[PDB]
Design a protein around this ligand. Structure first.
Ligand SMILES: *[C@@H]1O[C@H](CO[C@@H]2O[C@@H](C)[C@@H](O)[C@@H](O)[C@@H]2O)[C@@H](O[C@@H]2O[C@H](CO)[C@@H](O[C@@H]3O[C@H](CO[C@H]4O[C@H](CO)[C@@H](O)[C@H](O)[C@@H]4O)[C@@H](O)[C@H](O[C@H]4O[C@H](CO)[C@@H](O)[C@H](O)[C@@H]4O)[C@@H]3O)[C@H](O)[C@H]2NC(C)=O)[C@H](O)[C@H]1NC(C)=O
Ligand code: HEC
Ligand SMILES: *[C@@H]1O[C@H](CO)[C@@H](O[C@@H]2O[C@H](CO)[C@@H](O)[C@H](O)[C@H]2NC(C)=O)[C@H](O)[C@H]1NC(C)=O
Ligand SMILES: *[C@@H]1O[C@H](CO)[C@@H](O[C@@H]2O[C@H](CO)[C@@H](O)[C@H](O)[C@H]2NC(C)=O)[C@H](O)[C@H]1NC(C)=O
Ligand SMILES: [Ca+2]
Ligand SMILES: [Cl-]
Lengths: 70, 105, 466
């Protein structure tokens, strides 16, 4: 699942993406509705990330800053 | 394949109902002519030193480029009837049709 | 797999050797790196080696949406039911969307400017950051999907995110088919070959094989002969942009920082519209920015793209020039004089015979780009045949072709017939003056330009579900 050409890794499906940090904010927002969070938790569980701790921990392992989520 | 469908699958699967992988991703290319290999089934021409192709030595790709392709940049002929957008739409289109994967380091 | 630094020929490496008296690489012990394409059946003494296509062959905008379900979901905005594609959360282009950033362990975009720290972009295809002009077109279609989904939400409020995503994806795909077959392909093939290989569409034929032929992957690299040695950026008056209007191409490959920090996509799209393409001539085949300095900023040595094309055709075991001419029903030259007549250039035929010995062994890209160009076309007879045959199979063998019965209503087809690439530029950029008639022919400002008010916007009235 590694897209390589001319020796350059152009994409890796296993790595956490930067725009997915904005989904963590929605899950932690007390004003976001239940159906919205339910779709985001389903999206993250399909990547093996079942709890909010797992989601923040995956973002940390792949280089993102998660100080705001402490 | 679902006998009723309104949208394309992301993978291209099920577009052809009789052979559902035709056009789908992560499948071998179709061949319009049988492949021509140095050993008949896998090694490329130029692999083994001294081995000829159809009676002639294999020309180094860089040598062909240096002799036929090379030209002085400041003498470039601009195309009067094509915008550089004509070039760019082609690469964007090529990236809709094919990506040949190669092994990562 | 140490093909990036080693010049030893062991599988999967197949390095290009350096000839004597090379104009750039004086060290004959060095090499240009090259990894053999993955075989479809590894470790087999029964099947003749073939390669894989990681994408959908259909003209279905998979360079925007992806060709595998996990990447396609990652490209979507999952925080609402608006059916939008995800956008960059840190940067915007004058208040407009940019493609999201991708997370690569060894990012080549970061190597182009170490202080900027702008990584590669994330799109339907993994090569979106190869050159900022390609990035500008990927960004343009990302904005077009979001604009369409927004307009469909306002028309059909009860539609969920999946429905809005699918309905806009269907329109963007049809727009790519319309720009390709109506505006682009007739300018590649010329009128004779366009009528020959692409007659008037009749209907979907489930017996037409829609797969890409292995030869098309190398033949369609004729576009490398159109590449200019600079990236051109122009201001809101179509005049050179203040510092660095003509950037050498060896300093733009993987330079995603230039999109973010040097003015966004408007100056790049205006440069694409008002700069001519390079003309392919028999003694001016390809520029040194790709023949000597391809990806030199992000790699140990600058690659040679035309030489990579020829080595790739041998990696893929493709037959030579005469076998493809025979396949096309074209004459196959045996002597130097016969090759000179076919090319209408005896000096080029002499050069080709001195390198290859016989027109049987000429690599398909080299022979194809060597041929004289068809009237009002930018390919010769051989490449017109391969490209033309491929695109007919992609059109007739596609059950979701925009003109096929049941795909769209007659009223939606009438509405889609009004779309054009200059109008998509109008709808999703700060550009207000765009190219006239065919965007791919128009190339001189102001002669070939019109204001956006003259172009009608796509009417989505026929998409209403009461
Ligand atoms: C639906 O599309 C089908 C595919 O069409 C092809 O692709 C499209 C995009 C166009 O480019 C089109 O021109 C292509 O043909 C289409 O089916 C095809 O129809 C042709 C014509 O009937 C068939 O050709 C016949 O083939 C037989 C078998 O031999 C073939 O295969 C072998 C092995 O690969 C080769 O060695 C041969 O050279 C052939 O290619 C031949 O025996 C036959 O010979 C004819 O001889 C004389 C003329 O010389 C005639 O008077 C006779 O009556 C014979 O017919 C033909 O060459 C082709 O096999 C078939 N392909 C498929 C995939 O089924 C179909 O007709 C389209 N339908 C509609 C409604 O549009
Ligand atoms: C914008 C500058 C530009 C760069 C840089 C570029 N191309 Fe290509 N190129 C291709 C096709 C087709 C392939 C083969 C793609 C595949 O199947 O993986 C390709 C392959 C390549 C490869 C793989 C080389 C190898 O064999 O190892 C590189 C690198 C490349 N192109 C660089 C059609 C084009 C077209 C179409 C008109 C244009 C324009 C074009 N290319 C413009 C460019
Ligand atoms: C999903 O869509 C929403 C709405 O379009 C995006 O939210 C906007 O984000 C921009 C910056 O990226 C802000 O300036 C707007 O104020 C936001 N609007 C609303 C209503 O929230 C959101 O960023 C999108 N998510 C992704 C990952 O692209
Ligand atoms: C690398 O990118 C940086 C931006 O991150 C470029 O620096 C800017 O250059 C412009 C030149 O017009 C200056 O006006 C800015 O003040 C610079 N910004 C900063 C923060 O220094 C730099 O030029 C790029 N390097 C190369 C080689 O082009
Ligand atoms: Ca596709
Ligand atoms: Cl083939």
């Amino acid at each position: 699942k590694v897209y390589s050409q001319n020796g350059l890794v152009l994409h890796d499906d296993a790595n956490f993406l930067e725009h997915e940090l904005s989904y963590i904010d929605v899950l932690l927002d007390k004003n976001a509705d239940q159906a919205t969070k339910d779709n985001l938790r389903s999206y993250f569980a399909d990547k093996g990330l079942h709890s909010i701790k797992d989601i923040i921990n995956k973002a940390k392992q792949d280089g993102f800053d998660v100080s705001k989520y402490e | 394949c679902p006998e009723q469908d309104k949208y394309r699958t992301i993978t291209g699967m099920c577009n052809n109902r009789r052979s559902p992988t035709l056009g789908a991703s992560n499948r071998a290319f179709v061949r319009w002519l049988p492949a021509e290999y140095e050993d008949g089934f896998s090694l490329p021409y130029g692999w083994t030193p001294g081995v000829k192709r159809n009676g002639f030595p294999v020309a180094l790709a860089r040598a062909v480029s240096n002799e036929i392709v090379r030209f002085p940049t400041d003498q470039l002929t601009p195309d009067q009837e094509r915008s550089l957008m004509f070039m760019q739409w082609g690469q964007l289109l090529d990236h809709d049709l094919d990506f040949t994967p190669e092994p990562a380091a | 797999v140490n093909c990036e630094t080693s010049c030893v020929q062991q599988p999967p490496c197949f390095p290009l050797k350096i000839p004597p008296n090379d104009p750039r690489i004086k060290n004959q012990a060095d090499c240009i790196p090259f990894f053999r394409s993955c075989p479809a059946c590894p470790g087999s003494n029964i099947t003749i080696r073939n390669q894989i296509n990681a994408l959908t062959s259909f003209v279905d905008a998979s360079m925007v949406y992806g060709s595998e379900e996990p990447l396609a979901r990652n490209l979507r905005n999952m925080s609402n039911q608006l059916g939008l594609l995800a956008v960059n959360q840190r940067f915007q282009d004058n208040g407009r969307a940019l493609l999201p950033f991708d997370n690569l362990h060894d990012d080549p975009c970061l190597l182009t400017n170490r202080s900027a720290r702008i990584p590669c972009f994330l799109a339907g295809d993994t090569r979106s950051s190869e050159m900022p002009e390609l990035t500008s077109m990927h960004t343009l279609l990302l904005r077009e999907h979001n604009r369409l989904a927004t307009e469909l939400k306002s028309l059909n409020p009860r539609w969920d995110g999946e429905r809005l995503y699918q309905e806009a994806r269907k329109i963007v795909g049809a727009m790519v088919q319309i720009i390709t077959y109506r505006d682009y392909l007739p300018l590649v093939l010329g009128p004779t070959a366009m009528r020959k290989y692409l007659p008037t569409y009749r209907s979907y034929n489930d017996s037409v094989d829609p797969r890409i032929a292995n030869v098309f992957t190398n033949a369609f690299r004729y576009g490398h002969t159109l590449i200019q040695p600079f990236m051109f950026r122009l201001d809101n008056r179509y005049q050179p942009m203040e510092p660095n209007p003509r950037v050498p191409l060896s300093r733009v490959f993987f330079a995603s920082w230039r999109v973010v920090l040097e003015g966004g996509i408007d100056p790049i799209l205006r440069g694409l519209m008002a700069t001519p393409a390079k003309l392919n001539r028999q003694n001016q085949i390809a520029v040194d920015e790709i023949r000597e300095r391809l990806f030199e900023q992000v790699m140990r040595i600058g690659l040679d793209l035309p030489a990579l094309n020829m080595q790739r055709s041998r990696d893929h075991g493709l037959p030579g020039y005469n076998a493809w001419r025979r396949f096309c029903g074209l004459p196959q030259p045996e002597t130097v004089g016969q090759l000179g007549t076919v090319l209408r250039n005896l000096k080029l035929a002499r050069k080709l015979m001195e390198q290859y010995g016989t027109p049987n062994n000429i690599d398909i890209w080299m022979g194809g780009v060597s041929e004289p160009l068809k009237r009002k076309g930018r390919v010769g007879p051989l490449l017109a045949c391969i490209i033309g045959t491929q695109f007919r199979k992609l059109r007739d063998g596609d059950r979701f072709w925009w003109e096929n019965e049941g795909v769209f209503s007659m009223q939606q087809r009438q509405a889609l017939a009004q779309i054009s690439l200059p109008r998509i530029i109008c709808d999703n950029t700060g550009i207000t003056t765009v190219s006239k008639n065919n965007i791919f022919m128009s190339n001189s400002y102001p002669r070939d330009f019109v204001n956006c008010s003259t172009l009608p916007a796509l009417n989505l009235a026929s998409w209403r579900e009461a």
